[PDB]
Amino acid sequence: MNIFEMLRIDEGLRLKIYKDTEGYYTIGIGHLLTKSPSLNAAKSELDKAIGRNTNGVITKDEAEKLFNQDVDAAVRGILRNAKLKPVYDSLDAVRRAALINMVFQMGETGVAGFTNSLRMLQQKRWDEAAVNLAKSRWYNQTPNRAKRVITTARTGTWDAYK
Ligand SMILES: [Cl-]
Ligand SMILES: [Cl-]
Ligand SMILES: [Kr]
Ligand SMILES: [Kr]
Ligand SMILES: [Kr]
């Protein structure tokens, strides 16, 4: 398992514009297009990201291309975030994957806000981090996914994804 397979599991793959769990226009593997209510606007953002008039539908390849870009961007956001980087650097490879998934899902800013779990993680206090992480809107709104990511961070193994 790796970060790509992991997020491909959590986000799925859809070739036509769809709305995510919050109601936002998204396409591919969890690629948000806009927070706006407008399909037209979503469509504009999509053709802009793809480089052609998609009419709201893309190919697998194009979807994987956006995904590659988004993963990369998630890593680079972590590395540039002064509150995120040190946690990330302290972690083993599997746990790092968990942090990349959260950031992909909620953005840098959002995750940087989990001050307390960040610190427990940094301290390698796994069970404690796990309990804190679950006290969040994130967990109450997308509990199945949150649970898989939280077990990943807690245990350092991919068991939740097998
Ligand atoms: Cl883009
Ligand atoms: Cl769920
Ligand atoms: Kr994490
Ligand atoms: Kr976190
Ligand atoms: Kr954790």
SSE diagram, text form:
Layout: H1 3-11, E1 14-19, E2 25-28, E3 31-34, H2 39-50, H3 60-80, H4 85-90, H5 93-106, H6 108-112, H7 115-123, H8 126-134, H9 137-141, H10 143-155
Antiparallel strand pairs: 1-2, 2-3
Main β-sheet, in a few words? 3 strands, antiparallel
Associated small molecules: chloride ion, krypton
CATH 2nd-level architecture? Orthogonal Bundle
The CATH topology assignment is Lysozyme
As a percent range, the share of strand residues is 5-15%
State the CATH class.
Answer: Mainly Alpha
Count of discrete structural domains? 1
The count of strands amounts to: 3
Strand adjacency order, main sheet: 1-2-3
Structural class: mainly alpha
Level of helix content? Answer: 55-70%
Shape: elongated
Q: How many helices does DSSP assign?
A: 10
First CA to last CA: what distance? 9 Å
Radius of gyration: 16 Å
Write down the secondary-structure element order: HEEEHHHHHHHHH
What does this structure look like?
Belongs to the glycosyl hydrolase 24 family. The active site is at 11 (proton donor/acceptor), 20 (proton donor/acceptor). Its main location: host cell. InterPro entries: Endolysin_T4_type, Glyco_hydro_24, Lysozyme-like_dom_sf, Lysozyme_dom_sf, Phage_lysozyme-like, T4-type_lysozyme. There is one protein chain. The chain is mostly helical and 162 residues long. The protein has one domain (1-162): Lysozyme (Orthogonal Bundle). It contains 10 helices and 3 strands. It has a 3-stranded antiparallel β-sheet. Helix 8 runs antiparallel to helix 10. The longest helix is centred in the middle third of the chain and has 21 residues, at 60-80. It is elongated and about 50 Å long. One krypton binds next to helix 8 and helix 10.
